[PDB]
UniProtKB/Swiss-Prot annotation, chain A:
It comes from Human cytomegalovirus (strain AD169). This is Triplex capsid protein 2. Structural component of the T=16 icosahedral capsid. The capsid is composed of pentamers and hexamers of major capsid protein/MCP, which are linked together by heterotrimers called triplexes. These triplexes are formed by a single molecule of triplex protein 1/TRX1 and two copies of triplex protein 2/TRX2. Additionally, TRX1 is required for efficient transport of TRX2 to the nucleus, which is the site of capsid assembly. It is found in: Virion; Host nucleus. Belongs to the herpesviridae TRX2 protein family. Interacts with TRX1 and major capisd protein/MCP. GO terms for molecular function: structural molecule activity. GO terms for cellular component: host cell nucleus; viral capsid. Disulfide bonds: none annotated. The keyword ATP-binding does not apply. The chain holds residues 1 to 241 of 306 of the full protein. The keyword Coiled coil does not apply. Keywords: Capsid protein, Host nucleus, Virion.
From Swiss-Prot, chain D:
Homomultimer. Makes the hexons and eleven out of twelve pentons. Interacts with triplex proteins 1/TRX1 and 2/TRX2; adjacent capsomers are linked together in groups of three by triplexes, heterotrimeric complexes composed of one molecule of TRX1 and two molecules of TRX2. Interacts with scaffold protein; this interaction allows efficient MCP transport to the host nucleus. Interacts with capsid vertex component 2/CVC2. Interacts with the small capsomere-interacting protein/SCP. It comes from the Viruses. It comes from Human cytomegalovirus (strain AD169). The lineage of its organism: Viruses, Duplodnaviria, Heunggongvirae, Peploviricota, Herviviricetes. This is Major capsid protein. Coiled coil: none annotated.
From Swiss-Prot, chain G:
Structural component of the T=16 icosahedral capsid. The capsid is composed of pentamers and hexamers of major capsid protein/MCP, which are linked together by heterotrimers called triplexes. These triplexes are formed by a single molecule of triplex protein 1/TRX1 and two copies of triplex protein 2/TRX2. Additionally, TRX1 is required for efficient transport of TRX2 to the nucleus, which is the site of capsid assembly. GO terms for biological process: viral capsid assembly. It comes from the Viruses. The lineage of its organism: Viruses, Duplodnaviria, Heunggongvirae, Peploviricota, Herviviricetes. InterPro entries: Herpes_1 (IPR004999). It comes from Human cytomegalovirus (strain AD169) (HHV-5). The gene is TRX1. This is Triplex capsid protein 1.
Length: 241, 49, 49, 49, 49, 49, 290
């Protein structure tokens, strides 16, 4: 066949205001995925919007976003966009779409956006009932704790009264990474979390049947002999003795 | 015969010829010169125009 | 009717939980003329006496 | 607008404005050349029939 | 959106029109993308900021 | 009851791993082997109790 | 640093005469060797020569076949370079007819050593192997010196022909019903546990999936049987610490239109194998998983 293309041209169909083509000129070198990967793509397949559904689930997005072909936008103009498919190991600039500030040397991750809450960006590039959603690029630690929060929401959801789950989800969704707050957009328990519940409980239970007699006992051995701040809270999570 | 009745619907596809009509200078079609992008697949070079 | 058995017998034909949500969501009608239809009080009573 | 009669309300003139727009629709055609075809196209070996 | 006044001031070419259904119908049934009609004489054309 | 319904209506054991059901919830796999020999062509019908 | 100097287009090496020609033009000496044009000068493929004893050449004379090192104990034969086919005799996936078919083909002490060194170790198979890439340009002597690609396309010298990856048909598997425009090839060893020994079952699983998490999620689908048998052995035997139940390593990619059946032809022994045609090699690494 024709091999996978490095340069991909995107064409909009809806009439582009002189105001809005200027948003894409400021949107250059952004991380925009496509599922298709042909040479002359439609605008419909740009970005994450096509995967919005009535389910309104965040994990569906986290899961479908993993399969999409990440592309870096390039050489925007009237009538044309030129997405580039990056090659592994080669350098690229990356525009900072999200509010999160990027430390030097930090690794980055791609997760669907987490709206601030009270405020939203105006320059959505909505047109024809087609909004331009793009995935957030976040530092690795924030992308870790967003998933840890989501999984804890999924594990706590079962075996708990539905009113208790409201109180937990009301706080598990807000994240104060790097002094900014963020909120997961409609995190919902689903089948997509259910299979991960099964794999997490299975791996975490097979962990319990692999630690040696001394490996579990090390904390007891440590606290009975030496104490520090780290050990105080670990004495707490150990429930009783 | 049970109490209810059925009202099956059924779509049917017909292959067909179609006659378009369009007036003189109904549309202008502005064009530019075609451009030739090139890639190298170690084994071959595909170009697109 | 035997030919229809592959769809008359599917559970989604025989479970009204999806229908009850849409029926309860709208709720009682606001019209006064429907009101005579609205009110009847089924009340469980012990069989002792 | 035609002039109105006695006892009938008259017609105020009505300016109208409208706008047409262009629609974008480019095309693409790939042709590929095998590296064997390019290597003989430029490089020449011992010139042999 | 589309700026109107400068259309009512810029020398326009002039062309015999043709639309089935009196222009006001095709302005009323949204035949064209952008449109506006004013009945009297909008003094907005005279204002030049 | 499910065994006896599947054996009567003539469809049986459509069991797909949970990884595949999650994918079918979107993509909708083409889970129908075609006839050994179709002399007529595409077919369809629907059903409204 | 002049304004024109940044303005210059990048200069491709073919536009400049070869470095040997740049010396000979300066010093004018004329050797018998034809340094007018350098061969192998356009090769994104990276390669390595491996001496492989003549007992393992069979079914590798055809260009395109995995090379996998196999560490075994004894310091004298530090390693040994198994093909993918030679490893099929040990696999439980392979047909008994195919297994008894190709097992006759490896009737050499050098190859039988491989079965012995496979049986010898208690530790799991996936540990001992390290994939090296694919055969091309068999030296074909009393001791073949196989050229093996570490990265890039397999093809002839002069790019006159593209060697194709050959994967024996019993190992080849596809999860999906609608193939993507491009799809990655992964090699998958999967232990199914059993009393006397945990017998391995090899597979090669082309798929458009690239993400590791989604890939292993779909993999546990078919391998639920082996995974549950691993969990069952975990409780059946105390003080037994069996580890991972399949292992996946990214083997490269192919365009998924290239895939089609074929057969290898050797010693008048036809062998049905799937044939990825323009298979670029991009090695990964074994990734343990439950």
């Amino acid at each position: 066949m024709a091999a996978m293309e490095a340069n991909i041209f995107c064409t909009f169909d809806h009439k582009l205001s002189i105001a809005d083509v200027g948003k894409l000129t400021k949107l250059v070198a952004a991380v925009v995925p496509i599922p298709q990967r042909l040479h002359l793509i439609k605008h419909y397949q740009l970005g994450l919007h096509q995967f919005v559904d009535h389910t309104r689930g965040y994990v569906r997005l986290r899961g479908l976003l993993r399969n999409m072909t990440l592309t870096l936008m390039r050489r925007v103009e009237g009538n044309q966009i030129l997405l580039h498919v990056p090659t592994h190991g080669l350098l690229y600039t990356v525009l900072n779409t999200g509010p999160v500030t990027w430390e030097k040397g930090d690794a980055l991750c791609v997760l669907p956006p987490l709206f601030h809450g009270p405020l939203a960006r105006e320059n959505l590039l909505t047109l024809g009932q087609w909004e331009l959603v793009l995935p957030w690029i976040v530092p690795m630690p924030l992308a870790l704790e967003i998933n840890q929060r989501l999984l804890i929401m999924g594990l706590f959801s079962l075996d708990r009264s539905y009113e208790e789950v409201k109180a937990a989800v009301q706080q598990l969704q807000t994240i104060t990474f790097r002094d900014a707050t963020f909120t997961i957009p409609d995190p919902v328990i689903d089948q997509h979390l259910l299979i991960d519940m099964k794999t997490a409980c299975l791996s975490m239970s097979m962990v319990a049947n692999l630690a040696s007699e001394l490996t579990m006992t090390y904390v007891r051995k440590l606290a009975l002999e030496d104490s520090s701040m780290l050990l105080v809270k670990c004495q707490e999570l150990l429930m009783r003795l | 015969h049970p109490g209810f009745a059925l009202t099956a619907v059924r779509t049917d596809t017909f292959e067909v010829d179609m006659l378009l009509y369009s007036g003189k200078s109904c549309t202008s079609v502005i064009i530019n010169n075609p451009i030739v992008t090139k890639e190298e697949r170690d084994i071959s070079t595909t170009y697109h125009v | 009717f035997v030919d229809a058995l592959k769809t008359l017998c599917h559970p989604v034909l025989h479970e009204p939980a999806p229908c009850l949500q849409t029926f309860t969501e709208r709720g009682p009608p606001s019209e006064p003329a429907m009101q005579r239809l609205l009110e009847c009080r089924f009340q469980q009573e012990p069989m002792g006496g | 607008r035609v002039a109105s009669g006695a006892g009938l309300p008259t017609s105020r003139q009505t300016t109208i404005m409208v706008t047409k727009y262009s629609e974008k629709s480019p095309i693409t055609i790939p042709f590929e050349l095998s590296a064997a075809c390019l290597t003989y196209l430029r490089e020449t070996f011992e010139g042999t029939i | 959106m589309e700026n109107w006044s400068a259309l009512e001031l810029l020398p326009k070419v002039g062309i015999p029109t043709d639309f089935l259904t009196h222009v006001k119908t095709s302005a009323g049934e949204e035949m064209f993308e952008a449109l506006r009609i004013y009945y009297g004489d909008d003094p907005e054309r005279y204002n030049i900021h | 009851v499910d065994r006896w319904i599947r054996h009567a209506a003539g469809v049986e054991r459509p069991q797909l791993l949970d990884t595949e059901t999650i994918s079918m919830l979107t993509f909708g796999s083409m889970s129908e082997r075609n006839a050994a020999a179709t002399v007529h062509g595409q077919k369809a019908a629907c059903e409204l109790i | 640093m002049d304004a024109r100097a940044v303005a210059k287009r990048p200069r491709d090496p073919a536009d400049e005469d070869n470095e040997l020609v740049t010396a000979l033009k300066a010093k004018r000496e004329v050797n018998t060797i034809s340094v007018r044009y350098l061969y192998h000068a356009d090769h994104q493929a990276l390669t390595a020569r491996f001496f492989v004893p003549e007992g393992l050449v069979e079914f590798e004379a055809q260009p395109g076949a995995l090379l996998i090192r196999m560490e075994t104990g004894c310091d004298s034969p530090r390693h040994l370079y198994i093909s993918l086919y030679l490893l099929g005799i040990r696999a439980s996936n392979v047909s008994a007819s195919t297994r008894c078919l190709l097992e006759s083909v490896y009737t050499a002490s050098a190859a039988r050593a491989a079965l012995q060194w496979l049986d010898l170790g208690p530790h799991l198979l996936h540990r001992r192997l390290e994939t090296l890439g694919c055969v091309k340009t068999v030296s074909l002597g009393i001791t073949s010196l196989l050229t093996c690609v570490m990265r890039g396309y397999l093809y002839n010298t002069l790019k006159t022909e593209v060697f194709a990856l050959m994967i024996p048909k019993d190992m080849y598997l596809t999860w999906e019903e609608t193939r993507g425009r491009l799809q990655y090839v992964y090699l998958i060893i999967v232990y199914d546990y059993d009393g006397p020994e945990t017998r391995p079952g090899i597979y090669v699983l082309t798929s458009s999936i690239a993400h590791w998490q989604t890939l292993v999620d779909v993999a546990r689908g078919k391998f639920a049987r082996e995974r549950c048998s691993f969990v069952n052995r975990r409780i059946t035997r105390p003080r037994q610490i069996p580890l991972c139940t399949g292992v996946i390593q990214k083997l490269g990619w192919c365009l998924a239109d290239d895939i089609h059946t074929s057969f290898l032809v050797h010693k008048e022994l036809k062998l049905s194998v799937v044939r990825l045609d323009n298979f670029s090699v991009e090695l990964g690494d074994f990734r343990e998983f439950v």
